[PDB]
Amino acid sequence: TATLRPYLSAVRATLQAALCLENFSSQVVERHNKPEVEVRSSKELLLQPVTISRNEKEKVLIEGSINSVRVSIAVKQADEIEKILCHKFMRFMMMRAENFFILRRKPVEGYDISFLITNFHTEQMYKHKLVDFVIHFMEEIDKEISEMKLSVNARARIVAEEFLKNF
Amino acid sequence: ARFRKVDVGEYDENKFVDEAGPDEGEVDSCLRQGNMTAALQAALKNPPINTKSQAVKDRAGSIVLKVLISFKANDIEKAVQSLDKNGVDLLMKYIYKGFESPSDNSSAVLLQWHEKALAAGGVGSIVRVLTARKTV
Amino acid sequence: AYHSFLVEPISCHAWNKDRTQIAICPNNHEVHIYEKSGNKWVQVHELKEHNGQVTGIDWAPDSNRIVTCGTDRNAYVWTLKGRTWKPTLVILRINRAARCVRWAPNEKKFAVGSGSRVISICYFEQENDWWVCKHIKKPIRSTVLSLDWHPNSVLLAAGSCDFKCRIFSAYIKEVEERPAPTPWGSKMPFGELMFESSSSCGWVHGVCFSANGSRVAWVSHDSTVCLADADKKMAVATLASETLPLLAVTFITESSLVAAGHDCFPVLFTYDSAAGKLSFGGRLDVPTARERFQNAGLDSLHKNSVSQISVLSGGKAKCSQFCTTGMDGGMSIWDVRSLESALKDLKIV
Amino acid sequence: GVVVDSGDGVTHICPVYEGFSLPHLTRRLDIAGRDITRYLIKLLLLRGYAFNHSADFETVRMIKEKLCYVGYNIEQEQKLALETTVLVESYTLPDGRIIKVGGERFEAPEALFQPHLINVEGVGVAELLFNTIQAADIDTRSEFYKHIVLSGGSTMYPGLPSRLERELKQLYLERVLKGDVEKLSKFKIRIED
Amino acid sequence: GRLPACVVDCGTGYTKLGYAGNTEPQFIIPSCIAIKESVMKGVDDLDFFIGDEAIEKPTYATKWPIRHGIVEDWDLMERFMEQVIFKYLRAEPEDHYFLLTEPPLNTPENREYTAEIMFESFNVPGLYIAVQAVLALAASWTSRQVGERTLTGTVIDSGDGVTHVIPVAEGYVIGSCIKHIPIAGRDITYFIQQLLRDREVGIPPEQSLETAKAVKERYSYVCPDLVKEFNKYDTDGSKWIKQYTGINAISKKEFSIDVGYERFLGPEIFFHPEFANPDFTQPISEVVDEVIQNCPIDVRRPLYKNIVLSGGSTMFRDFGRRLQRDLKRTVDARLKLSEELSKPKPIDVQVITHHMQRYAVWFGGSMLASTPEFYQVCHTKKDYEEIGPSICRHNPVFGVM
Amino acid sequence: MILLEVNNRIIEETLALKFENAAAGNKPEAVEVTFADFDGVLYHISNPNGDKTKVMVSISLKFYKELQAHGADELLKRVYGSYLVNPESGYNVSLLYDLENLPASKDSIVHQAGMLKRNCFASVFEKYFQFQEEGKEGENRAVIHYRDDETMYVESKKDRVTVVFSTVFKDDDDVVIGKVFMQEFKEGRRASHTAPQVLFSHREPPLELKDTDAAVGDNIGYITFVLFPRHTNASARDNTINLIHTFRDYLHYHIKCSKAYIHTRMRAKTSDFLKVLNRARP
Amino acid sequence: PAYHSSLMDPDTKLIGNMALLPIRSQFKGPAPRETKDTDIVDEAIYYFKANVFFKNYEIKNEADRTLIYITLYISECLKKLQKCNSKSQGEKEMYTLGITNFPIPGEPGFPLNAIYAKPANKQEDEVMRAYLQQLRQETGLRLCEKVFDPQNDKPSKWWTCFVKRQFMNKSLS
Ligand SMILES: Cc1[nH]c2ccccc2c1CCNC(=O)c1ccccc1F
């Protein structure tokens, strides 16, 4: 994995730069407060979207704004069983978005999972722990997808033998 | 039901509105003679900052990317350290430009540039990649 | 010297004349006033009137009046009647949240920057017994994030989300008289644009006029600090930082600046008048008989973004103590002379 | 100018020309506070919460006052509710049980602009206000438009003023300019409060 | 379709399963699952048992996934449905619409969790989650006392843990007004177990509950008046004092005991909780009155005319009778004081009893899932995939109109 | 439970209860039950003509005529004999138990009643096993549409008997989990060298069927079992039929338990992420 | 609710706040003479088995205090009666019990001092003391024709079981 540490470093530094947020009232609608990267009603409040890619398939998209940051991840999916496990695990978490609270209910078109960190989050939580968590998450969903692949294969071998051994 | 379809904000007279490349041959010249650092500093010259065509900018990126890949891992720290702060910040911008075009494991060595470019410019240079209105 | 008033962010703060009381907005609709007693802080007042989050507070020293502005588009001038602060409404005539407010040095006017892309200059009219305001609109195009008055109480510096730092004339001939000449210009009619920065990127979070008012500084989201010298044809010295953006800045001498932001600690900047160059003076927050004895994963006093800085004593000409409040609900008091001992390598000016 | 009043009882668009009211040109809207509270109760049932229209009316009203608002761009508001959790808020009931309210915060008030939602005929307050001023003294219109004032409890919804202005413009642009977005910046609308 | 829908009612103590159309559950098993607990690999997750088979497996631990009518362990609950479907019902889940039940006040999120399991684990083609109280009302339509269908009524559900008085209006439970009573089947057993200890000698200590539960289920009932009852048992003890005989667990010997007073004393603690609970004293008749008075004035009478019973603890002979008499005394008294302090219209109080009370919920579900309308109000797998699991937050009530 | 049970529990628990009460001498209660089994099977247990002293058990299969064309009627009669009466309208096979005339060992007829579905399939297998054991080759293969869109082919060859299943995976992702299991079956000999050879073909039927109107599709999967004399002979026969007729439902059963186990993994991991996320709070 | 007395007559006199109810008895005391076929001691013995289970009892009038006292006492008689082998020994121990001086309103040891008015003077003290003794005596002798079944030397277990239960959670002991 000569390419994993370098990749996670670039991604971490970008997130450190992007998570510099502040509370911001709406210039467009009176008494409304909204994440600018989502509504995008004021171009001057949106930062430049940047991408960090490890290879053609794995990458992270970071879209900043004055009071919010959208983070999208393209997860490593080597084969079919990995594609469906990832897609199931990602949906699993998104369905529990209200408890995750920094999770988007749907990913940005083209990615597997997206976070939506706001100034309210950076006010209540150490932004460096949030950066830590996004890196930890990227490493852990890959380990879990691998453990899941092993589990399914292992149980299938036993299921096939129990049936076959009974003839 | 028809009239709520048009975005009237688009004509809000209170909105916000913001205010030709490196020498292709000069770069090749340096690259062909194996003078990498020279090729880098030459490619980081007169960037298509104020140009309107998305083609001119992509052309400039291609040249910069072509130089970055041509490098040898151990010869990255040296070249980066021969740039003035404004150079590093432009480099950083190009490094993030390349990430949008992975291929032949180009991203692998680009992550090496990003590492060194960061060690020289700090997170500040990445910040200046995000805040830019006129980009590469 | 750190103290924690709460865990949520301190939206903004303001000290009274004696620096014996501090008003703060504990990330809500109120303003709490704390007073020191021995070495503890006690809450003496609670100003409830705003219908929205309080975004700015300023305390006129001589007249002892507090002015607040909020996301509810209002502004209030608070007057102390005996033992209780009484508010007075000020129609700002804006339809978006107010973001910042500052009393002019002459305590005759106060300015409110807002999301309406305008600056509301307010003054009182005795004949009708209430406050009125005029608008400095052009050429502001986005939300006004920061304000700071020139010592003559006429020139006004402003930083907005359209990436510009500007100096205007907030001359109200009905409460003050013709302003003396300034190196920024001779003609200062109301709303006159005296100066405009050239940068095309970077929200301007903070702006500050020097003690004599001939120099103006500001920090942008692009991790840079700038200083425009009026006595040099408004030339601009810029210094691109290698770290995170700064959100607040102040002068501590005519050639010294102290700033803080998303890195969570105060840093020093020095201006070389001759070379017209800004230089990094170093981080100011580094980890007797009682001292020798006595002596989250952050090595800084504040544990989250520092959003405001203010001089406590010694003014902007020769500051001896300054204050910082932040998104971590803390308030720090820094002593300039101590910081000089602990760091021999430290300059200043 | 024009006074748009909406309370717990009903909504009225009362025009007033240099002096007094003009019963002619003064229309009513069959939607108000009580109706919005009722719709919120229906929306909260479709969310899995057991609210009774008569037993918990006062409890849902208090939820409406503290959490509801008027969306500016509905299409954009539904995206926030559908793709994110920024609109979700917790609310404790008198017995201590906690519920979570999201999209329904702007969905209920929307009835004011789209009557069919609560199944009532007519057009939205915005469209009603437009019509009123149009079929009136062509030499007082511009005066009326830049002098609209909201009053009543059912008009304090965050963002309401912005929403009205956005629609009045959308109605103008076409129903009096045939889609010509050229002369649009010279249209002055300023709603007080 | 040619195939009937599956009806599964998971309660805290027992789970009732079967096919729609039938009058009674095809199975009634304890809501427990036994597993090995001493990281999981291979197929350790499939190595388990449920119901009676789980209660005493030598090398397995027994877990109860449901507490207070709510799922507290989704991992276990999901495995439990694996056997409910493939071992007992033997239904290919993809070919059957399912009807599940939930206690009132189950969070909307729990319904999404249920839907995730049914649609994504078992791929069911359609799902409906009904609230138990409402099915209980539907069940009462089988009674002769009712000639008009209606889903407005007060449900008195008493199982073995706690008793619930649930007001319901037009198919929707009035949650803000629900009240719970700390007197259930188990309490009736403990009290009876206490009465025996003070009188009958010879009952094997280790067989204390056994005997008490037996007496409760075989000889208990509700009486109209305690003194006139004690009086009977003394005037002609021959007719009222029954006998019971059990066998000593460790000696297979045979012991007999007289079963007297507890026959009517046990069930009595519903109407006089103070007899057994030092912390609760409200008679069940007063709780119902309170709950109904806490509801909208305009729905109070309909509630009084349609109080429905549900659960085993309501099966005692004359339970309804005693409840209705007591409720009519409290309500009529109130109207007396009023008229005097001055003439209200008499309020009709009616407790409904029917044959399907024991498993009223399952029966209501079974009958409703047998109708054509059940197939329209169900959420299909196609709507689950397009719109999402949030569509299971609400289930259109049906059956009346 | 790894292997699926063959006997239907509703039938057994219903007959056992009625038989126990009949023997106790209790007045017979009425019975009326409708239930199902895997693959479109509908059962009905009732009292013919209201006579509560008689209990009937009927089974309905949409494809019965196909099993019948392969000796199903004869086999069921040998097995049930006098209990097998004329089929109740709507069903294909009916068993009648007289509560007033039960054998001495009732726990033996109850067992066979629980296997009604299994016995209906038995004949087709026995008929082709028999062919194999008699060298009769070239005999037309049996085609049993056990589900609206699933078919089972049986054919006897000189030294081997092959059973082919054409199965559908409605859920697109179930095809992928299925492939994982099918791959393990195709390598089963590496664990049981004497067991049947299993083949798997995704989207297309084995070439011998490429000419019939066999189904082709992204969600179709063909599984082939090759049974050898040691499996088809008179000694193993019953056990072998008990396994092979449950295979289809065994495979789909395990794919679904596989997904349920993945869920417990996701619950544990998602739960752990949330604990870490919350430690980012002061 | 619990079982309350109905012997409170407008002519019924009082001793403290306890109703001085007439009883049919030979024993001495200030208890009036009852002519009717039922007196407070009967009413208390009849209702006993029921009332004894109640924890709360609403005092509707002074007769209920008298009724409550007999109830608590009947419980005291069962402790003793529980341990004896004859309707004879019971009567002899039931006599001794009745003579023993138990606590009275106002004195510590007497539960319910908040519900029973104490003797306002020495005359009331002796009169009340004697009335309570008379009630105890009559209740005691009247309780043996019940507790024992024709099989003498046998206290019916259907009366011996209530020995562990205390009306309103109080006891004269
Ligand atoms: C349960 C409850 N308590 C109330 C107090 C005041 C007004 C309404 C209510 C309700 C009914 C609405 N709540 C629910 O349906 C609910 C269900 C599950 C979990 C929490 C809930 F609040």
Side-chain angles (χ1 to χ4, degrees), chain D residues 44-45 48-52 55-57 59-60 63 91 93-99, chain E residues 104-109 111 173-178:
Chain D
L44 293 177
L45 270 168
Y49 293 122
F51 288 106
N52 181 71
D56 314 299
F57 188 87
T59 295
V60 182
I63 299 177
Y91 182 103
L93 305 172
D95 57 12
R97 288 191 168 71
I98 306 179
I99 65 166
Chain E
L105 272 52
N106 183 48
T107 59
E109 291 89 343
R111 306 195 189 92
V173 163
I174 300 187
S176 72
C177 297
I178 296 159

Side-chain angles (χ1 to χ4, degrees), chain B residues 14-19 85 89 120-125 127-128 131-134, chain C residues 117 137 141-142 162-164 200-202 221-224 240-245:
Chain B
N14 214 303
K15 190 182 181 179
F16 184 88
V17 189
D18 286 285
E19 239 74 300
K85 298 309 174 181
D89 292 60
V123 73
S125 60
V127 165
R128 286 186 287 281
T131 45
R133 306 299 302 184
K134 310 171 302 172
Chain C
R117 304 168 155 73
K137 182 75 196 69
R141 299 176 68 223
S142 185
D162 52 29
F163 325 126
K164 300 296 194 180
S200 183
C201 65
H221 204 75
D222 73 309
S223 277
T224 61
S241 187
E242 278 153 41
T243 57
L244 299 184

Side-chain angles (χ1 to χ4, degrees), chain G residues 1-10 12-144 146-152 154-173:
Chain G
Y3 292 90
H4 293 60
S5 171
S6 44
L7 307 173
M8 191 71 226
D9 262 314
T12 303
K13 304 311 169 196
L14 304 173
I15 171 58
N17 44 21
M18 298 194 62
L20 193 68
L21 263 33
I23 64 170
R24 201 132 222 173
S25 169
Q26 277 195 297
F27 298 107
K28 300 167 192 179
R33 297 189 182 88
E34 174 60 288
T35 53
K36 295 178 295 183
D37 60 315
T38 298
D39 60 39
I40 196 66
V41 181
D42 291 306
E43 202 172 55
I45 283 168
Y46 185 54
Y47 300 147
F48 185 76
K49 294 182 187 298
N51 286 319
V52 75
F53 284 97
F54 289 84
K55 259 58 185 185
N56 308 301
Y57 195 106
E58 157 181 50
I59 303 175
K60 301 179 187 174
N61 56 48
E62 22 271 310
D64 287 328
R65 296 202 181 71
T66 308
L67 175 50
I68 289 163
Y69 180 74
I70 298 168
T71 301
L72 282 173
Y73 181 59
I74 293 179
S75 207
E76 302 297 306
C77 292
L78 299 184
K79 277 71 163 295
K80 244 70 181 180
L81 245 43
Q82 171 175 51
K83 301 174 184 173
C84 75
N85 294 65
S86 51
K87 179 176 182 178
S88 53
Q89 181 175 308
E91 296 179 61
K92 300 300 180 178
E93 221 167 313
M94 217 67 275
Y95 176 73
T96 314
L97 205 299
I99 306 308
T100 69
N101 181 278
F102 281 99
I104 65 181
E107 305 183 306
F110 179 79
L112 309 174
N113 283 305
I115 273 179
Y116 285 68
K118 67 172 182 179
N121 66 54
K122 186 64 175 188
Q123 206 198 321
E124 284 185 54
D125 197 78
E126 302 191 304
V127 175
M128 178 184 269
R129 269 255 177 55
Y131 180 59
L132 261 40
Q133 185 190 69
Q134 184 172 45
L135 291 171
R136 295 202 293 289
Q137 299 204 73
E138 191 55 37
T139 291
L141 105 147
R142 197 176 296 180
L143 236 187
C144 288
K146 294 276 187 180
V147 181
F148 294 80
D149 66 306
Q151 310 308 70
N152 203 299
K154 305 176 194 170
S156 183
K157 66 176 182 182
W158 301 92
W159 275 97
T160 301
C161 54
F162 300 90
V163 69
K164 295 183 65 173
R165 296 182 173 294
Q166 302 182 302
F167 180 54
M168 303 186 291
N169 294 308
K170 307 293 184 180
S171 173
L172 296 180
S173 295

Side-chain angles (χ1 to χ4, degrees), chain A residues 84 89 92-93 99-101 124-126 129 133 137 140 144 151-152 155-157 159-161 163-164 166, chain F residues 3 173 181 184 188 191 195 225 239 243 250 254 258 261-262 265-266 269-270 273-274 277 280-282:
Chain A
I84 74 89
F89 187 22
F92 181 82
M93 301 191 271
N99 295 315
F100 230 133
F101 58 77
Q124 309 165 188
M125 309 177 252
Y126 301 86
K129 286 276 63 178
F133 173 86
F137 183 85
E140 295 300 322
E144 183 51 43
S151 283
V152 176
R155 82 184 290 113
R157 186 162 291 177
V159 162
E161 305 182 326
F163 190 78
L164 249 41
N166 276 307
Chain F
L3 294 170
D173 295 337
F181 283 89
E184 286 304 291
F225 273 76
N239 182 72
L243 282 175
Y250 173 84
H254 281 290
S258 194
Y261 171 68
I262 299 308
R265 272 207 156 266
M266 304 185 315
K269 196 68 175 191
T270 291
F273 279 149
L274 291 179
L277 219 199
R281 289 190 149 71

Side-chain angles (χ1 to χ4, degrees), chain D residues 130-156:
Chain D
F130 176 62
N131 297 172
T132 299
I133 291 184
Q134 285 305 284
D137 312 49
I138 316 295
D139 287 5
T140 70
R141 290 179 169 180
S142 291
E143 190 63 57
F144 269 154
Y145 279 159
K146 60 183 297 297
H147 280 65
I148 299 180
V149 64
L150 299 323
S151 181
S154 186
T155 56
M156 307 186 279

